[PDB]
Amino acid sequence: SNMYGFGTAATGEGSGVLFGNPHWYWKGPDRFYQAQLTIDGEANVSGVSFLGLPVIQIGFNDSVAWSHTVSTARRFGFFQLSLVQGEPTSYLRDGVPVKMKPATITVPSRNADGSVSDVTRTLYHSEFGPLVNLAGLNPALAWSQGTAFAIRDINGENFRTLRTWMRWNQAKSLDEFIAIQKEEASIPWVNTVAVGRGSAKAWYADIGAVPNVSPAQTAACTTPFGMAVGQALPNVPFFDGSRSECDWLTDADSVQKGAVGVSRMPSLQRDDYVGNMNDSYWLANVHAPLTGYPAIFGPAGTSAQTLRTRMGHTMALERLAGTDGYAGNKATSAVVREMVLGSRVFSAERFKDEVLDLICTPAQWTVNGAAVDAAQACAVLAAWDNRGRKDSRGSHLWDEFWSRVPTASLFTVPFSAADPLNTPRGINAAAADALRQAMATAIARVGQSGYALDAPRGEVLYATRGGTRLPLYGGCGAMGYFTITCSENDITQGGYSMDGQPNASNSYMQVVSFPASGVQAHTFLTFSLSDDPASPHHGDYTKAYSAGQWLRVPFTEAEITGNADYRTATVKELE
Amino acid sequence: SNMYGFGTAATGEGSGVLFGNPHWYWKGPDRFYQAQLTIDGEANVSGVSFLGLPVIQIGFNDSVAWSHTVSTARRFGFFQLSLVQGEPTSYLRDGVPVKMKPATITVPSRNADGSVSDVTRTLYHSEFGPLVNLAGLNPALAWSQGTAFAIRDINGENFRTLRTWMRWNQAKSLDEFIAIQKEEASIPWVNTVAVGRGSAKAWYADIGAVPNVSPAQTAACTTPFGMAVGQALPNVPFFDGSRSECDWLTDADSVQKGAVGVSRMPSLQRDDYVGNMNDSYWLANVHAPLTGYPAIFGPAGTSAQTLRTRMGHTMALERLAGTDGYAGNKATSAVVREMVLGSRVFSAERFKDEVLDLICTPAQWTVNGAAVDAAQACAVLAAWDNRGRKDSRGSHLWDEFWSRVPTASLFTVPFSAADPLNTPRGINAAAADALRQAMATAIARVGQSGYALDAPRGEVLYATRGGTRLPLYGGCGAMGYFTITCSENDITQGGYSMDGQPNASNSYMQVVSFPASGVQAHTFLTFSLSDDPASPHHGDYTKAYSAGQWLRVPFTEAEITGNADYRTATVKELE
Amino acid sequence: FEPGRTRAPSLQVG
Amino acid sequence: FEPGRTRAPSLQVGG
Amino acid sequence: STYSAEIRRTTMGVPHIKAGNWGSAGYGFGYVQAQDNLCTMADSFLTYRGERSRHLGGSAQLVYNSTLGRPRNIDSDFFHRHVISDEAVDRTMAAQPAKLLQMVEGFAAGYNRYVREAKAGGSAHAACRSEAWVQPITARDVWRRIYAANLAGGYSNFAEAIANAQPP
Amino acid sequence: STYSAEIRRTTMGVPHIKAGNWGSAGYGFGYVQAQDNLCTMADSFLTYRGERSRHLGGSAQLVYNSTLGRPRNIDSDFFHRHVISDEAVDRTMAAQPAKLLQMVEGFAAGYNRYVREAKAGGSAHAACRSEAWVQPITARDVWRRIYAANLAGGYSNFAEAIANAQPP
Ligand SMILES: O=C(O)Cc1ccccc1
Ligand SMILES: O=C(O)Cc1ccccc1
């Protein structure tokens, strides 16, 4: 997921601009559903909910617009239980035995022959949360006579989340939005960015529900099992549940027991921009990095950022620098609408020429002892515009190549926290053999798919509606796309079809601003509103997305009633 | 898989006719490859091997033709081990400690990021065979301080299988073929049927390598876990490996230790026919049922046969009664070639009229509280020819329906061993609601697929080659097809495409006879010889199969050199 | 031992 | 404990 | 005392629900979501109630990917019944403001209204409209789904592992 | 001595190998099988040798369905190394007639000849011809594949279970 909040200095208008771009499911019940709710004297809000949720989770009203991205902050931990021996369904706490609480559950299950069998299991809870089978994580982690494991999710006891989005749906300013976020400290697993009418600064926060452990606890309470799997579960507290001093802590300003207090969770307001593309809070704005917050929120300088994070902040900086090829140097709603679909590929922009210089002369190779003719791959890539637009040619060769390049010792300029957008970089001449291996395989895979090496991307990457393959643009985060359209289909099985259950991709998108006349929002719901192939709303929006045609979504009563497709009907029944 | 051997009472000629029809993989290294090997003075054999095998496994020579189908006889068992105190990698044999044999194995493994690292495990053998983790079968079955489990496959010690096929490749008569089968007792997990030049009798056997346990041992040696899991592992001996009295037994005429002796394995010779379609040896010929062989071979008179077995014996009887619509009443090569592709559907032949009479008047239903209009489904199915030929209309609606009908309480006339082709039968009027639910689902699924209820089967079931969808015929065993073309693709994902990794389907087919002038064989290799889409032999045989045009495969030197496509070349090198 | 935790394997070769 | 027996689960929600 | 919602649809079918109170707003919103996505939603309420296996078989995977991933139905059903117990639902609902309790009651009623219409006839949701698992739901079932969304960062990732925790 | 085989191909590409001895028949048969199916075969030799993970990742599944089913590469590798050990290969080979050992040596040599040809050039097997896992094999490797086919009714069905059997 990506989001930006541009402040008034960045937009040059009297209002900021909010860009919401969750990358999310195209099918299933967690997919988004776009709607407006107008509740007399109470709320008037528009945006999306997951199917089955009743309040708007990403959206806007007349006063504030906001979005979310999944946060790096861990939200769960494990507790290693020391068992009362001979009684493996009890565990010790400071030397006193505690019974696990059993639940005998019967599930009816339909058989091949039509009959129904009951399936019965007794499952358990500890004071921390449910027991969990960790033998799959490592066989040494079985529930034995001596040891079991429980998982605690901070959100299992957080009953505040829906109420928080409800209050945001109602909020009449960004100040109020901020106050609600702080009062509730409930946001369960995402960052938030918001822009408000009449506010100069955009808001970023990872203020929500987060386990609270101290560095001294992590050192004292992590069990030897915990240390041995800690690298598989980075920042997840894996603690000795037999010791009460290893319970999650509570701060004087914690809203929930065991959770991080409000003043120790990261946020930032900026006149220019904030953004997030799923790395930690560190670079909400690259000019003003955030540091010093609890380790569980993720690294703030020890780790290189993803290619998508590098691409997303590069796009913001180049817009405000006026060096991205769009007119002017302000992040206006109109320019943001274009920039976020522009499908630049960071890995190609930064590394393609160096890779081609290093491996394309000569263009006939010996790879694993076999003759490989790379002349067409080299020429097609040299000519390619480094974008995944519908008409871009050879972009899918780059996808098959870059995704296969080994990363160890690939770069000669290592990550530097002083420049996390431009490092690491510098393709290592010593990688030449490995890069040719990766390119030979790419060439072979594109060959097997039946597409030409220089096929336009919209023939490779598409969504079928009504029997017609609508051409798409964008790509996968691993290549350094910001515009995400990321198929789970192997290219050799009919190309990058978006028709199955694709990887997290562009879903609900909104660009929202607050001109003097009233909030204005431009939206997409890329997969369309309805899952029913017979509905006119199964493919209409997707046809618009393929065309790059943002929908101006009506908001005021006059806009709704004046809409060219307006229909109304009233549903009523006795409560 | 299916096979028939017709003897001379059925052919009315001086030799029998063999039909081999393994249903098997269309991709992968177990798939068949058709070839002839002529080794001067030693062998001249034609047929198929799995890729990577060097002798013919199913085929013919100038004197005998044979085929195989997977046998119901279990080929393995488990041994539950009683572990030596304090040494969970030792087990007790009649109270004496025996150490398991360790192997510490290191496998190099490529990572996410393209680096390679070592993975090391120490794994174990017992005197029975390798240790096996049975926790996935049921959690109580874990390797604990007191108990472990080993698996014994009698083929683990059977080094005779390849040489038995080699000897069969060289055999000069059906008599010799039989003697080889009995002398080697090595066939590892298949039935065998064969026919010979100049022999009146066709041969059926399940004579090969099979674990040898007595009823007394099954009663006394099966441990409590063995009892508890036995229903998931029918007829698999699950024995106490701490007692030497539970070791598999050796008969006086056992070729291999722990295997069933030659005279206690089923075989049958008939002048009319033998056949098998994957049920046990019982009904190799319906007029002369075989009984009294070891339990491990499977049921002989107490289990209903599958619909495909009922269909395959029905086809043989009706050929010999002259009541199936083909010419005369003999199973000659020419008639057998047409009969085995005829794509009759047993479930529809036997039950479609009873179903439609029960559910189709009225054809406006209430199904789970919902109005359902079944009038077009009823009318399409009534008009349908009960076949899965390329032009058959509605056959896919039948597949989507029958595969969903609850078989518990479906039939009112149970299985009778005295009428095994025609029982169970009698659609139960109490199943009407359940049948309407299945039909409503089937209508919904065909609706989601894009095909009309009355689409010709050739548009739904197809193999694509060179961009063209070649229409196919046949279907899945579950509906009582004999002619198997059984896609793993859901109909709603583009129909019954055969282009992925279909379920076991028609693959190498041979119809082999021995007229005076020499053996004659007509064949298919349905998916074509080569897995490379560039090859002219990736799709040529598939186009012939779609057309039903059997290949007359040349076999004599004059036939090979006289073939319209003949090319030759020599490959030679040192050593 | 609980039958509500048995997972039958595949046993038909092919 | 054998580190190489470890199989990490998928911790990124939506990922 | 009646739910009443005015449903206005514009380009791309986006619904703009207008109502005089929260329960009625829930009523219109549950109705439009079901009208457009009944097959996905009806399948989902089997998930959250732990009733997939009854209808679809225990060894089949979830139909749709989501924050739960696609475990086997039997394990998903154990996970939801154990973690989203009636006790968890009681505690969740006991913490809520009356307006949201009313909204969710209305949402279940709106969804149910649409199920009645789809069972009665129509060319819509032909893929599932006659299935047994297209059925009315309760406000508790919607709280099940709401609580489920909370757990994406933690419990949801260990659904099978929680369903299979057993002492030796 | 020299392997020498005559390859005659007829309609549908069916090859009829003619040779004066068993080693030479194996040479011609290994050659034509590779010539038509190199990609499936080269992938399969990784399976029987326990070398899939090195090239394709331990966590990826087998590419093709077969009697082995599609376990993860790492588990398959361990299964094949443990069960189709060098001893099992030694014992298998010690039990064979000279003519069959000669045939299987010819077969390896004929497969390897085709590997040399694919590495040098040509429009065939574009999908895999330049990959590292296309590589010569030995007679012992062919014996591993031959023994693997014997195991379909027993050990093949429990490959992951055998690979993961470990004391507590
Ligand atoms: O935040 C995301 O990246 C995905 C998501 C965002 C907000 C709410 C649900 C899902
Ligand atoms: O026999 C079968 O049904 C399948 C099969 C594959 C290979 C050899 C013999 C049989």
Numbering used by the authors:
A (entry chain C), B (entry chain F): 1 to 575
C (entry chain E): 8 to 21
D (entry chain B): 8 to 22
E (entry chain A), F (entry chain D): 11 to 178
The authors write:
The recombinant MacQ protein exhibited bifunctional acylase activity against various ranges of AHLs and against multiple β-lactam antibiotics, including penicillin G, ampicillin, and amoxicillin. The MacQ protein is comprised of 806 amino acid residues, including an N-terminal signal peptide, and belongs to the N-terminal nucleophile (Ntn) hydrolase superfamily. AHL-acylase is one of the enzymes capable of inactivating AHLs via hydrolysis of the amide bond of the acyl side-chain to produce homoserine lactone (HSL) and fatty acid. The MacQ structure clearly revealed a typical Ntn-hydrolase fold comprised of a four-layered α-β-β-α motif45 mainly composed of two polypeptide chains, α- and β-chains, generated by self-cleaving activity.
The crystal structures of MacQ, both ligand-free and in complex with the reaction products of decanoic acid (C10) and phenyl acetic acid (PAA), were determined at 2.6 Å, 2.2 Å, and 1.75 Å resolution, respectively. The C10 complex crystallized in the P1 space group, similar to that of ligand-free MacQ, while the PAA complex crystallized in the P21 space group. The structure of the PAA complex was solved by the molecular replacement method using the ligand-free MacQ as a search model. The asymmetric unit of the P21 lattice also contains two PAA-bound molecules, which superimposed well on those of ligand-free and C10 complexes of MacQ in the P1 lattice, with an RMS difference of ~1.0 Å for 1505 Cα atoms. The reaction product, C10/PAA, was successfully trapped at the hydrophobic active-site pocket, while the electron density for the hydrolyzed counterpart, HSL/6-aminopenicillanic acid (6-APA), was not observed. The results suggest that the more hydrophilic HSL/6-APA diffused into the solvent immediately after the enzymatic amidohydrolyzing reaction. In contrast, PAA was bound in the same state in each active-site pocket without covalent bonds. The atomic models of PAA in two different conformations fit well to the observed electron density and were refined with reasonable B-factor values in all active sites. The C10/PAA was accommodated in the highly hydrophobic active-site pocket created by the side-chains of Trp24β, Phe32β, Phe50β, Gln57β, Ile58β, His68β, Val70β, Trp165β, Trp189β, and Val190β. First, the SP is observed in all heterodimeric units of MacQ in the same conformation, both in the presence and absence of ligands.
